[PDB]
């Protein structure tokens, strides 16, 4: 109930519009390192993928999370952006 | 001349091999005058050979040779004001140790090696002598005596310059004294380098909190008497001017933060120049920008000094650097705790941003558990990131059980036993779990509790409770009192905030009474309830079921679970009757205790605490004399026996059952009893107060690395209990007991010890105000809380 | 207490006593021996004497003290395999308590900091001296502790499963992955890091979770 | 150690109190320099507290009495010349005092505490203070002309080396075990020497006969130097911080055990030893009547024979001690108690 | 006496089972932190292990 209390839980990759808004296609990926810092997961099963997860979770109000996805190619160039802003 | 063979004499374990092995000549050797002369140079040379000496034949040499002894055992004797283990490494250093050699002349280095100890400690006439007794084999045992002097003492400190402050208002903060007042116990003028050191900072930060921004301390003297006994401190200063700082600019990377730091670094117009500000400026700085995870900022600050204006301009550059990102929480040093028990506590999460205030939240929330000893807190940087910490809490673990067991008086009522084991971190699960029982020959008591404070992961609590409790006067059916009595009681508890949390229950209660003693408070209780049992007889009986919704309300901000230094802790709890139960009435009670720190390291503490009850009956009703509160005793006034304050029975005349002669009995008719006697029965009543005053202090003798597991303080103990229902119309000439004001006092000592069994208290009180039946009890001892 | 005798007789009772079983008064002569006479013909022997007769007293500080201070002292010896066997011995045990384990609690979960020095040291005994007798003990040993410090990440991931803080816990199931990708725990722990997939919606790494979780039960 | 016991002395003649007259408090338990001062049959004592006296010299009687005092500290012996009376403070302050009223002639702050006795010499008043500093003060306006720096060891012996004057050049010793030749015109340095052995080595005032200096260090040597070059010329193993007194071709000084010892000039080679006062915390020497006359801490005055050393009289004076050194001048011998009574022995 | 303190709780032990790669995708590369070697298993194991000190002269 909404009577207990619950203290705030964060999780992931702190993120700003700002932050975001340096990412280019074609970036090499110590270059994204640099723009975000290091992301706290990645893909384990043989992809070269980087995440950037916004997640926030009040003590009562409702989940808002951010996800980026960063796929690179083999030689770990940036080449797709995945935005998703909310749910 | 030719080496034919080695030959040796003298020597029984130094070995001729090694031997051998390092002189420049050995067996088949051709050798020459020179070429003997060099060996018997190394032989000489060895160490552990004492002399040599040579036989030299036409054709071959022969050599004898002397076993340096070896050391047996090294001894001390003297040297009171220092004990033995460094003394020990110091000789050890010096080049002398067990299972080694010494020549005789080294005791002229030894001893000056030594004496130059006590010479740095402090005791420059000290002297210092050895011998040394031969074994039966080859080893020598040596008896060391130590001569220590008169300690040299300071005879003044003096400060050259000083125009500003005078020199005693200036030496009153330094922890070297040439001067002792008339009452101090402890404290002394001995000497002590390092501590000069400390003094002279203290100075200069004296001087630079009142804006002497420019001062220094050009040079300091020390010298001795030529007797060696007194010793002379000189300190010369430059004070200079005092400024009154301009205005503060900040700059550099400020990450956003602009806004915060200015309102940090705000100043009013004209104020003085001050050193401590300015740290503390930047502290906080830093610690503001730790609340947003950036761990490792770069904070300086650089003062600019106006020569003519005499004001200081002062520059604060700041970098804020990257925002670090929690890898791992690590828990070392939980041998017997379950991981998730200091898990559950933490603020900071694992696989987040950093905030430094969350860690030290979770430092708190651990040590306001009480199943720890020590807990700290580690910030490690990941290697070869640049953004990554991991968090790493270091506990000690401590006895959280009390084994409470004692024997009672063997007076004519027979031995009785009384037994209890109370847990409160049960087998590293984070449970309480507590059992009582109590056997005698009129009693047999029991109880049960066990509560998970974890029962959901935010914190919600849920436990229960179980009871039997059963009196009988005598081991029949004829007539004699007998009280029976079992119960539940089951509670949900949850938290609203950081430090505040709600209870909510349920309870049940049986009570089963027989053959009471007519008495005034008792039976008024009984009219109120409708029954009429006749006052001049012991036939009656009464029985009750009763359910009641309990609740409750704790605030707990305690610095720490066990000796607590700072915060405050509030419990409320209180019971009402549900419709249906045959009693009908509510009570509550209010515990307090708070805790004052009057010194930097909280080794002076003044606690104040007090207690609170209040109960009444809802209809016509009263409440049950079987709730009543109780008051002296080790838990509420030192001084008095347990539950010996507060109103005292009244019986009525009447008939004794199971009368016997050569037992005493109040009120009965059977030894010419003929109208209403006072009596120092306590009964207890409806209404409590009690408040304590105490002062911690250290404890006198023991050693700092046991300081932790001993409190000892004085106190001031007051408390009163009333009944709100005695009518004092009816019975003028008896004590009103409904008058409040009758407050017993009492003053005395406590000591308080972490034992291995649970925490023991002893204390000495004497109880200087007094109330007519009351009894004393001036020392007690106590198990357990 | 001990006579002022010369190391052989006093050695001999030494040896008399551990036979015996006293294991006290045998470390009392012990310490004599290296104390008196140090650099004797008998230090080696007294010194792995020492080490022995520590452990069964369980005076675990000076056992690890002693191997420590013979491993230092002779970096070569006959005999080092089997002060390593002892050093992982005394590690082990420290990581285990009496009355606990009377009433059968399962302490995968408290600090495994033992179990891991524990494990350093067979591991080291086991590719350093395949030959030696305590080989297969310490393989053993082995197998035994990795299940331990693989229980206990499970038993982490577990509980950020209940807060509800997903990235530790993929983390977590990750490092076991990496760490303990043949025991029990790890099988155990892949539900929990699909799970946390699903619940920030990352469908694409939770279908990869459940293909090897189809692929691996049975 | 312990204290030698009192010797038992048949005195040959007995000593008397000619007059006694109390000074304020005195110094006390501190370690100073303060002493009394005789010229012009007119005797002038101080105290720490500040107080200043001038005493008739033939009956102790009062002529004028001043405070210079907040304590003054007043720790620098009384010297008298040409109508001022000096005075050094542990406050860093010297004061010209006139003789016929006592009134502040000048003050002057100097760079320490000036705990040695001021030295007066062609119309310079010379200062050696704590701090390793020796001063030179104008007598008549007091300004400060020179100064010369000398090297502190980290610990050292409270009190410094008075210098002394020859043909224009100061010697004075240090703390450091070195005695030092400044020139007066500005304070050049002409040599400087070490008297110490191969640990606390500060030095003594100097005497300087037929070109020839002799110095004494603390645990070091007593040595003979070359007035011009410094050179030593012979030495011997002899420690003191009491002064040392020159007379004829003996030597008469007081180790730092308190052993009373007479050397030749030449050489330095012992005539007698005297040691029935060991570890008796005695001043430093003066001769007075053909006799050597030593006090000790427990109030007793010691009158030694300069041929073979045995005592000749013993008399209990004051019940406070003696610390500071006594004054024999126109045949008149004075000495002032800790507790800062005046005495005049006869 | 002669045995190790403790139990014999380690020797029953469940083996260790290597996972299977599904088609099409790897499993994460393993640190060697923790692997153990394939070693003889001709040793006494237990209580059967014999653990005093070895006798040398």
Same mark, same amino acid.
């Given at each position: ?87 | ?8 004499? *003298? ?26 002369s060099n060996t018997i140079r190394a032989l000489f040379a060895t160490g552990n050979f004492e002399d040599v000496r040579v036989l030299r034949d036409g054709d071959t040499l022969l050599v004898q040779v002397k076993e340096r002894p070896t ?140 804006? @002497? ?18 010793? @002379? ?50 502290? &906080? ?69 950093? %905030? ?97 404070? @974890? ?12 009871? @039997? ?19 539940? &009681? ?16 349920? *309870? ?39 359910? /009641? ?23 409320? /709890? ?64 030192? *001084?008095?026996?347990?539950? /010996? ?25 059977? &030894? ?24 911690? /202090? ?34 003028? %000439? ?25 925490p023991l208290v002893f204390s000495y009180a004497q109880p200087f105000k007094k109330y007519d039946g009351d009894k004393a009890e001036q020392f007690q001892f106590n198990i357990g809380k | 207490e001990v006579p002022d005798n010369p190391p ?49 007293? !369980? ?21 080092? =395999? ?10 082990? !045990? ?13 302490? $995968? ?10 494990? $350093?040291?067979? $591991? ?22 990795? =299940? ?8 982490? !991931? ?56 189809? !692929?691996? $039960?049975? | ?52 006296? +001038? ?84 007598? +008549? ?82 040595? +003979? ?122 | ?47 059967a292990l014999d653990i005093r000190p070895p006798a040398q002269p």
């Amino acid at each position: 109930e909404r009577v207990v209390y619950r203290p705030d839980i964060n999780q992931g990759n702190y993120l700003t519009a700002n932050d975001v808004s340096k990412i280019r296609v074609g970036m090499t990926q110590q270059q994204v390192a640099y723009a975000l810092g290091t992301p706290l997961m990645s893909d384990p099963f043989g992809t070269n993928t980087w995440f950037y997860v916004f997640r926030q979770q009040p003590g009562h109000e409702g989940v808002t999370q951010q996800t980026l996805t960063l796929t690179f190619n083999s030689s770990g160039v940036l080449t797709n952006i995945d935005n998703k802003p909310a749910l | 001349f030719v080496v034919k063979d080695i030959h040796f004499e *003298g020597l029984q374990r130094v070995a001729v091999g090694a031997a051998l092995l390092s002189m420049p000549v050995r067996t088949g050797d051709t050798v020459n005058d020179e070429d003997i002369s060099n060996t018997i140079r190394a032989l000489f040379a060895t160490g552990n050979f004492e002399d040599v000496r040579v036989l030299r034949d036409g054709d071959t040499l022969l050599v004898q040779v002397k076993e340096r002894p070896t050391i047996a055992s090294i001894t001390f004797s003297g040297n009171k004001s220092v004990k033995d283990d460094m003394l020990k490494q110091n000789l050890e250093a010096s080049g002398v140790r067990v299972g080694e050699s010494l020549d005789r002349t080294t005791i002229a280095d030894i001893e000056k090696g030594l004496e130059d100890f006590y010479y740095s400690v402090g005791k420059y006439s000290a002297s210092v002598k050895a011998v040394v007794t031969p074994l039966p084999r080859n080893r020598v045992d040596l008896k060391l005596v130590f001569q220590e002097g008169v300690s040299a003492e300071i005879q003044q400190i003096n400060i050259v310059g000083n125009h500003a402050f005078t020199t005693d208002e200036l030496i009153s903060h330094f922890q070297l004294r040439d001067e002792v007042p008339w009452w101090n116990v402890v404290g002394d003028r001995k000497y002590q380098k390092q501590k000069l050191a400390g003094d002279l900072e203290t100075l200069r930060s004296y001087y630079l909190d009142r804006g @002497y921004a420019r001062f220094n301390i050009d040079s300091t003297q020390v010298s001795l008497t030529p007797d060696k006994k007194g010793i @002379y401190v000189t300190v010369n200063i430059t004070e200079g001017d005092q400024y009154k700082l301009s205005g503060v600019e900040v700059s550099g990377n400020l990450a956003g933060h602009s806004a915060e730091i200015e309102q940090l670094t705000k100043i009013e117009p004209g104020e003085l120049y001050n050193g401590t500000k300015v740290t503390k400026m930047e502290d &906080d700085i830093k610690k503001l920008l730790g609340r947003y995870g950036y761990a490792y900022p770069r904070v300086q600050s650089m003062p600019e000094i106006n020569d003519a204006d005499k004001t200081v301009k002062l520059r604060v550059n700041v970098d804020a650097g990257n925002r670090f990102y929690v890898r791992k929480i690590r828990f070392e040093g939980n041998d017997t705790s379950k991981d998730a028990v200091l898990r559950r506590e933490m603020r900071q999460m694992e696989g987040a941003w950093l %905030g430094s205030d969350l860690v030290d939240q979770g430092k708190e929330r651990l040590n306001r558990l009480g199943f720890f000893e020590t807990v700290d807190t580690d910030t490690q940087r990941v290697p070869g990131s640049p953004d990554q910490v991991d968090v790493v809490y270091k506990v000690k673990e401590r006895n959280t059980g009390s084994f409470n067991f004692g024997i009672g008086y063997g007076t004519e009522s027979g031995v009785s036993f009384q037994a209890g084991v109370q847990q409160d971190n049960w087998l590293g699960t984070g449970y309480a779990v507590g059992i009582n029982g109590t056997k005698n020959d009129y009693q047999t008591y029991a109880e049960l509790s066990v509560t998970n404070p @974890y029962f959901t992961v935010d914190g919600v609590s849920l436990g229960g409770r179980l009871f @039997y409790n059963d009196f009988q006067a005598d081991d029949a059916d004829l007539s004699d009192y007998t009280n029976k009595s079992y119960g539940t &009681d089951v509670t949900l508890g949850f938290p609203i905030n950081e430090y505040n949390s709600l209870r909510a229950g349920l *309870g049940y209660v049986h009570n089963s009474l027989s053959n009471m003693q007519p008495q005034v408070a008792m039976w008024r209780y009984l009219y109120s309830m409708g029954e009429h049992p006749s006052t001049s007889d012991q036939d009656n009986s009464f029985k009750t079921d009763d359910f /009641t919704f309990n609740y409750g309300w704790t605030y707990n901000k305690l610095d720490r679970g066990y000796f607590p230094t700072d915060g405050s802790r509030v419990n409320l /709890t209180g019971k009402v009757t549900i419709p249906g139960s045959d009693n009908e009435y509510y009570k509550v009670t209010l515990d307090t205790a708070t805790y004052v720190p009057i010194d930097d390291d909280h080794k002076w503490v003044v606690l104040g605490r007090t207690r609170w009850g209040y109960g009444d009956g809802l209809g016509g009703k009263e409440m049950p004399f079987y709730e009543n509160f109780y008051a002296g005793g080790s838990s509420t006034v030192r *001084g008095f026996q347990s539950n /010996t304050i507060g109103p005292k029975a009244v019986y009525f005349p009447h008939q004794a059952s199971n009368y016997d002669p050569d037992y005493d009995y109040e009120c009965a008719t059977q &030894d010419g009893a003929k109208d209403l006697c006072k009596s120092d029965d306590a009964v207890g009543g409806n209404a409590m107060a009690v408040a304590s005053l105490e002062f911690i /202090t250290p404890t006198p003798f023991i050693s700092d690395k046991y300081a932790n597991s001993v409190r000892t303080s004085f106190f001031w103990d007051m408390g009163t209990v009333w009944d709100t229902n005695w009518d004092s119309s009816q019975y003028s %000439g008896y004590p009103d007991y409904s008058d409040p004001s009758n407050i017993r006092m009492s003053a005395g000592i406590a000591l308080q010890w972490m034992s291995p069994l649970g925490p023991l208290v002893f204390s000495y009180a004497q109880p200087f105000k007094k109330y007519d039946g009351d009894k004393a009890e001036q020392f007690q001892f106590n198990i357990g809380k | 207490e001990v006579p002022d005798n010369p190391p052989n007789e006093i050695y001999a009772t030494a040896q008399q006593k551990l036979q015996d079983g006293n294991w006290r008064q045998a470390i009392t002569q012990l310490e004599a021996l290296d104390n008196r006479y140090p650099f004797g013909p008998y230090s080696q022997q007294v010194q792995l004497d020492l080490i022995y007769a520590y452990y069964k007293n !369980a005076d675990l500080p000076l056992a690890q003290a002693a191997i420590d201070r013979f491993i230092r002292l002779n970096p070569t010896h006959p005999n080092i =395999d089997y002060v390593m066997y002892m050093r992982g011995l005394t590690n082990m !045990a420290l990581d285990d308590s009496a009355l606990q384990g009377f009433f059968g609690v399962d302490r $995968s979960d408290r600090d495994p900091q033992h179990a891991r020095a524990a494990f $350093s040291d067979f $591991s080291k005994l086991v590719r350093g001296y395949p030959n030696s007798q305590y080989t297969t003990d310490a393989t053993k040993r082995l197998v035994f502790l990795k =299940d331990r410090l693989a229980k206990y990440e499970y038993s982490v !991931a577990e509980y950020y499963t209940e807060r509800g803080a997903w990235v530790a816990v993929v983390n977590r199931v990750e490092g076991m992955l990496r760490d303990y990708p043949d025991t029990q725990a790890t099988r155990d722990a892949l539900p929990l890091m699909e799970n946390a997939y699903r619940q920030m919606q990352m469908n694409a790494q939770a279908e990869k979770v459940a293909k090897i979780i189809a !692929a691996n $039960s049975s | 150690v312990k204290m030698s016991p009192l010797p038992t002395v048949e005195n040959q003649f007995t000593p008397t109190t000619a007059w006694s007259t109390s000074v304020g408090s005195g110094i006390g338990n501190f370690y100073s320099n303060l002493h009394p001062a005789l010229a012009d049959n007119v005797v002038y004592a101080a105290d720490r507290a500040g107080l200043v006296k +001038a005493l008739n010299a033939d009956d102790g009687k009062e002529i004028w009495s001043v405070s210079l005092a907040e304590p003054a500290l007043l720790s620098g012996g009384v010297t008298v010349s040409g109508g001022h009376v000096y005075i050094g403070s542990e406050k860093a302050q010297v004061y010209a005092l006139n003789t016929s009223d006592g009134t502040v002639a000048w003050q002057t702050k100097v760079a320490g505490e000036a705990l040695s006795r001021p030295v007066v010499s062609d119309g310079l008043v010379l200062i050696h203070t704590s701090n390793g500093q020796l001063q030179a003060l104008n007598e +008549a306006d007091g300004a400060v002309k020179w100064t010369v720096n000398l090297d502190m060891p980290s610990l050292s012996l409270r009190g410094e080396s008075a210098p002394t004057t020859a043909f224009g050049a100061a010697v004075v010793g240090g703390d450091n075990g070195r005695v030092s030749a400044v020139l007066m015109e500005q304070g050049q340095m002409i040599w400087q020497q070490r008297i110490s052995q191969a640990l606390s080595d500060v030095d003594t005032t100097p005497v300087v006969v037929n070109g020839v200096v002799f110095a004494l260090a603390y645990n070091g040597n007593l040595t +003979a130097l070359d007035l011009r070059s410094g050179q030593i010329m012979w030495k011997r193993e002899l420690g003191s911080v009491n002064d040392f007194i020159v007379d004829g071709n003996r030597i008469y000084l007081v180790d730092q055990n308190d052993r009373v010892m007479a050397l030749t000039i030449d050489g330095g080679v012992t005539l007698w030893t005297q040691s029935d006062l060991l570890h008796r915390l005695l001043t430093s020497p003066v001769l007075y009547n053909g006799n050597l006359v030593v006090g000790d801490s427990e109030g007793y005055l010691h009158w030694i024979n300069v041929e073979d050393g045995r005592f000749v009289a013993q008399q209990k004076v004051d019940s406070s001690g003696f610390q500071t050194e006594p004054v024999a001048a126109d045949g008149k011998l004075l000495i002032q108690a800790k507790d800062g009574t005046v005495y005049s022995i006869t | 006496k002669r045995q190790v303190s403790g139990d014999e709780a380690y020797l029953e032990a469940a083996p260790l089972a290597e996972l299977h790669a599904p088609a099409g995708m790897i499993l994460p590369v393993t640190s060697g932190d923790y692997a153990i070697p394939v070693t003889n298993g001709s040793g006494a194991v237990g209580k059967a292990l014999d653990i005093r000190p070895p006798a040398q002269p």
